[PDB]
Design a protein around this ligand. Structure first.
Ligand SMILES: *[C@@H]1O[C@H](CO)[C@@H](O)[C@H](O)[C@H]1NC(C)=O
Lengths: 223, 213, 188
């Protein structure tokens, strides 16, 4: 199938520049337009520009001095550069999308998006603590247990359970910006209480800006 | 630029019911308007193009109509997984402009939250900080109030809440309230409780623990 | 007498006009001045860099002919309203309408909101990839065009671009080609 794999999240200082990638696969890369889209905090979608891989292009007046789009057929990769970064280009998720065959008008395939954060603050890895299932504090046959991912910067963080094998009953809460300028969140899961002694639960936290790949076992805290 | 304006920012509906989101263009854009669907934590998915044409693989319950300036995207029988933000985009001229979006919330019967409380781990305590967590699980509607009590003393300005997006399976929400203290203040007191009130609780639900045990 | 060619872009930066000039003759290794009817000024000195001379100033008279004399080397009595060069259009786009089986072509031009040069005529030229420099041209007055699918080769890619001219009180030259746009046609 068609795939548009974008680069990972980025942290950049104000005034500096950024370069995001979008590698296409699964189709003739040279026959389709490639557009870039911005999703601001307010969930609004702003087009950025288009590029035809056979040669080139650009668009949108508002992004004339910010955006610079280029392409490489050899690797089938569309690259996208940011110049005078501000505190406004940050809280934006940047998507790469493919325009339909006959025209680049509307976009039929989208990448996963790259989160950009431009702040004078430095990177901070997360501390992963357990939220142990208290044998007294379980609703009947169901027990809740989780992981607290505290004090990290910037967004985002990827939390999984048992390397993805545990999906039923998982709830990863949106990060909250603490007074310390660092982020923190919790990821909980409900399981049959009888399984607390027979089955093992590990939470896998991944913070790419700090390159921290943490695993934490969550055990019923003994007396 | 051609400005696309979606009248309503939020819409609530029951499962199996109809929904019609409207989108108005500042200029004539003929019949060239597309509709995208963005589910929680996902990228936008193209559902409709050219006002009324359905993209391949899109279910038939999604339809579109309109021309010139007025357009309407319609779900004939909304389903649980239809939770998303729906955008209109004029694919008529350059620059390409989207609408503000419309979040489609699903209305369902009341669901009381399941309350759990987690004390801070010995690791974090030895680090020098204590985070007590209160989990409200699978409740509806979204509004639920949580108060913190340390030895029956009401807390204020030292806790933070975070609520999830509506679940695509049971149409519920979940909330996490984190109370943050220092190791000194934590070991200084004994009882830690969160009291939860919700539309589905005939009386407050208190979950507590004694420091230690 | 040495030969030259000039063109004046009007209503560019706000109302500041720009009159550029260049030599027709091929070799002019010199180890340029234009006077005439103006407003608030009698004669102004061009700026010199490489082989182009322009000034950006707001005090300009649109009414009256002017004698341009090269320094005195050569003179030419030209009208400021007869050497106008429009700004190249932009934001060119083509959209296929599946229902009507046609392609709508749209573009924009900053002259629409201009005071003096507000009436233009645009030439849209489109060609197929295969044809070695053959172009289908269409003259228009609006900012939108419709190309019928039946009048286009199926399963073919087309490149398209647009130019403009004053076509009212003002006369001058054709603008530069806008950035091209590319679109495909369904396979019958
Ligand atoms: C054309 O450009 C003007 C100048 O800013 C702008 O106001 C207008 O919205 C544009 N129209 C289109 C269709 O791009």
């Amino acid at each position: 199938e068609v795939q548009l794999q974008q680069s990972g999240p980025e942290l950049v200082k104000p005034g500096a520049s950024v370069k995001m990638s979008c590698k296409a696969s699964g189709y003739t890369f040279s026959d389709y337009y490639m557009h870039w889209v911005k999703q601001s905090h307010g969930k609004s979608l702003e087009w950025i520009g288009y590029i035809y891989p056979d040669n080139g292009g650009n668009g949108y007046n508002q992004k004339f001095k910010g955006k610079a789009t280029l392409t490489v057929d050899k690797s089938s990769s569309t690259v996208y550069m940011e110049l005078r970064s501000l505190t406004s280009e940050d809280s934006a998720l940047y998507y790469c999308a493919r325009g339909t065959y006959y025209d680049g008008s509307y976009f039929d395939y989208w990448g996963q998006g790259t989160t950009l954060t431009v702040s004078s603050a430095s990177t901070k890895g997360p501390s992963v603590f357990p939220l142990a299932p208290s044998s007294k504090s379980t609703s009947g046959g169901t027990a809740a247990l989780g992981c607290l991912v505290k004090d990290y910067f910037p967004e985002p963080v990827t939390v999984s359970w048992n390397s993805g094998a545990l999906t039923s009953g998982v709830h990863t809460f949106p990060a909250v910006l603490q007074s310390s300028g660092l982020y923190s969140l919790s990821s909980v899961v409900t399981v049959p209480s009888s399984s607390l002694g027979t089955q093992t639960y590990i939470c896998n936290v991944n913070h790419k800006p700090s390159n921290t790949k943490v695993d934490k076992k969550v055990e019923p805290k003994s007396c | 630029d051609i400005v696309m304006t979606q009248s309503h920012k939020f819409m609530s509906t029951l499962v199996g019911d109809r929904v019609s989101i409207t989108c108005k263009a500042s200029q004539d854009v003929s019949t060239t308007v597309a509709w995208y669907q963005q589910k929680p934590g996902q990228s936008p998915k193209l559902l409709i193009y050219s006002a009324s044409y359905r993209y391949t693989g899109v279910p038939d319950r999604f339809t579109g109509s309109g021309s010139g300036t007025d357009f309407t995207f319609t779900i004939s029988s909304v389903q649980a997984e239809d939770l998303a933000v729906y955008y209109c985009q004029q694919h008529y001229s350059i620059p390409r402009t989207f609408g503000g979006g419309t979040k489609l919330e699903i209305k369902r019967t009341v669901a009381a939250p399941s309350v759990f409380i987690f004390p801070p781990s010995d690791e974090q305590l030895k680090s020098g900080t204590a985070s007590v967590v209160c989990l409200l699980n699978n409740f509806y509607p979204r509004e639920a109030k949580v108060q913190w009590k340390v030895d029956n003393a009401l807390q204020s300005g030292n806790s933070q809440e975070s609520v999830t997006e509506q679940d695509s399976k049971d149409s519920t929400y979940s909330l996490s309230s984190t109370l943050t203290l220092s190791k000194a203040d934590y070991e200084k007191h004994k009882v830690y409780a969160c009291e939860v009130t919700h539309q589905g609780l005939s009386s407050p639900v208190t979950k507590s623990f004694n420091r230690g045990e | 007498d040495y030969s030259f060619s000039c063109y004046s872009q009007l209503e560019v930066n706000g109302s500041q006009h720009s009159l550029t000039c260049a030599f027709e003759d091929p070799d002019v290794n010199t180890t340029f001045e234009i006077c005439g009817a103006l407003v608030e000024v009698k004669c102004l000195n061009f700026r010199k860099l490489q082989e182009i001379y322009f000034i950006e100033t707001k005090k300009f008279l649109l009414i009256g002919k002017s004698n341009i004399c090269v320094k005195s080397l050569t003179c030419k009595k030209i009208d400021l309203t007869t050497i106008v060069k429009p700004e190249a259009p932009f934001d060119l786009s083509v959209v296929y309408r599946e229902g009507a089986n046609d392609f709508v072509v749209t573009f924009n031009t900053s002259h629409l909101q201009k005071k003096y040069v507000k009436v233009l005529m645009h030439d849209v030229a489109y060609r197929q990839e295969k044809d070695e420099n053959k172009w289908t041209h269409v003259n228009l007055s609006s900012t939108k065009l419709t190309l019928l699918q039946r009048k286009l080769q199926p399963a073919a890619m087309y490149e398209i671009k647009v130019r403009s001219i004053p076509d009212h009180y003002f006369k001058g030259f054709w603008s530069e080609w806008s950035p091209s746009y590319y679109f495909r046609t369904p396979e019958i």
